[PDB]
Amino acid sequence: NTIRVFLPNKQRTVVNVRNGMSLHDCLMKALKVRGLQPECCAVFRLLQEHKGKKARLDWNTDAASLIGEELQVDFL
């Protein structure tokens, strides 16, 4: 039961997001671990069978419910 949040540039990371670990907690962590920032980084959900572009995502979704899929983040 874990979600796969891909770091910026092109990385695949996944951690335990139970209880209600919103994207703000999982991202603010890997975000401070690298010394980045939310004002410059944006969240994106895996392309749910669309044209060819990542889908947007709010900054408060529940990762404990999105587990199984993979979230992505880059510089907006």
Side-chain angles (χ1 to χ4, degrees):
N1 202 90
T2 36
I3 189 80
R4 300 161 169 199
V5 180
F6 278 58
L7 246 71
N9 178 39
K10 58 115 94 170
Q11 264 275 98
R12 177 162 106 275
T13 289
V14 59
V15 298
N16 298 271
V17 296
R18 217 93 75 75
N19 273 330
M21 269 211 191
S22 55
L23 260 177
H24 218 307
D25 297 62
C26 296
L27 293 176
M28 181 149 104
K29 288 268 196 196
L31 178 152
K32 66 163 284 157
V33 180
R34 278 264 139 161
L36 301 180
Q37 58 169 326
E39 286 168 58
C40 195
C41 285
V43 300
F44 288 107
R45 66 171 279 161
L46 187 67
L47 282 94
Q48 58 137 289
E49 198 210 81
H50 217 159
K51 265 204 93 181
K53 59 175 203 94
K54 58 250 145 139
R56 226 100 94 161
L57 230 181
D58 58 287
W59 251 116
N60 266 100
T61 183
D62 269 300
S65 216
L66 202 66
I67 154 280
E69 264 175 76
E70 312 192 327
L71 179 130
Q72 178 145 56
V73 184
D74 217 71
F75 281 125
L76 59 96

